[PDB]
Swiss-Prot record:
It comes from the Eukaryota. Endothelial cells are unique in synthesizing thrombomodulin. Endothelial cell receptor that plays a critical role in regulating several physiological processes including hemostasis, coagulation, fibrinolysis, inflammation, and angiogenesis. Acts as a cofactor for thrombin activation of protein C/PROC on the surface of vascular endothelial cells leading to initiation of the activated protein C anticoagulant pathway. Also accelerates the activation of the plasma carboxypeptidase B2/CPB2, which catalyzes removal of C-terminal basic amino acids from its substrates including kinins or anaphylatoxins leading to fibrinolysis inhibition. It is found in: Membrane. Disulfide bonds join C1-C13. Interacts with ITGAL, ITGAM and ITGB2. Interacts with thrombin/F2; this interaction switches the specificity of thrombin from a procoagulant to an anticoagulant and antifibrinolytic protease. Interacts with ANGP1 and ANGP2; these interactions significantly inhibit the generation of activated PC and TAFIa/CPB2 by the thrombin/thrombomodulin complex. Interacts with PF4; this interaction enhances generation of activated protein C. Interacts with HMGB1; this interaction inhibits HMGB1 inflammatory activity. This is Thrombomodulin. N-glycosylated. The iron and 2-oxoglutarate dependent 3-hydroxylation of aspartate and asparagine is (R) stereospecific within EGF domains.
Length: 18
């Protein structure tokens, strides 16, 4: 996951949509 798409909850690819 690139910039903006970070790791949340328990270190998982989180969404964003720009």
């Amino acid at each position: 996951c690139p910039e903006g798409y970070i790791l949340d909850d328990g270190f998982i690819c989180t969404d964003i949509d720009e």
